[PDB]
Design a protein around this ligand. Structure first.
Ligand SMILES: [Cl-]
Ligand SMILES: [Cl-]
Ligand SMILES: [Mg+2]
Ligand SMILES: [Mg+2]
Lengths: 171, 171
């Protein structure tokens, strides 16, 4: 993952977010700060907030990261796809974790129903929630989810994915 | 998978079941015939029926398959384990399907909450529900689930697993 791709990973609330484009920001729902009246200096009313389960997407009415190109955001990825979780730590440390993705489905995790995709790490911490799952397609990168959960032990993680009905996912 | 292992796969209700031992039979809950007053000629009262979600286990008070040895039944298997789904078709055809197992979790599938493990086929049909997921450990085979679901397209399947709390599963 190149420097510019990492610059998209942003500290947000109790976790992190990812700039898909100059105006689009995605993150995990449970890290989004409520009680606030604005995000990155933009009033809530000037933002289109779409939240589906643990997947949250913000569309600002103003270019927040005009330096970035738009990049492709898909709903999860095919079974077996080896992604990379672009985890940033508060210290600044980068911890890219390779993971082979599994099935997409709605899973009951810690009481809440999470629509995402699990995967097997090839460790994560609570504060990592929001980190983007990415993978390379040709010479460009694609983001397909945001870190939403991990098992206590073992090597299982889950990235929440955007809403969407498909035949490849467990409905 | 040897002949004796396949002889454990038994037609049951709208699907199939698996003889773990002379007295233990496991199958998928939604294939179990209700309204009946007995199973394999044994009155319901003489059977200990344990059903947890889509996982059902029968313990008969009498040896039904005294020809079989007991074999190991575990709750799912480690991420990445390549299992084999011992699918039998009504015609008699054997269709062993290789699948690399994924995460264990409670998934909302077709309205119902299924506690199982998904996997990627390396196709199944409704009537296959109940087929055992098995894998070889040393010189012996181990069963760790029963077919409970499959995606419309793609290569995703799910085997229901017995109840049990663990740190490697998404709780
Ligand atoms: Cl950066
Ligand atoms: Cl047989
Ligand atoms: Mg997986
Ligand atoms: Mg899988």
């Amino acid at each position: 993952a190149p420097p510019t791709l990492w610059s998209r990973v942003t500290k947000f609330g109790s976790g992190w977010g990812f700039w898909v484009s100059p105006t689009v920001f995605i993150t995990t729902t449970h890290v989004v700060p409520t009680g606030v009246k604005e995000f990155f200096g933009e009033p809530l009313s000037s933002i289109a907030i779409h939240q589906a389960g643990e997947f949250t997407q913000f569309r600002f009415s103003k270019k927040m990261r005009p330096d970035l190109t738009g990049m492709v955001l898909e709903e999860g990825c095919p079974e077996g796809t080896v992604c990379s979780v672009l985890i940033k730590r508060d210290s600044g440390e980068l911890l890219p974790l390779a993971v082979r993705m599994g099935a997409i489905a709605s899973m009951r995790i810690q009481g809440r129903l999470v629509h995402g995709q699990s995967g097997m790490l090839l460790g994560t911490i609570p504060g990592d929630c929001g980190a983007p799952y990415v993978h390379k397609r040709g010479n460009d990168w694609v983001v397909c989810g945001v870190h939403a959960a991990a098992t206590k032990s073992g090597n299982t993680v889950v990235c929440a994915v955007q809403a969407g009905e498909g035949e490849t996912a467990l409905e």
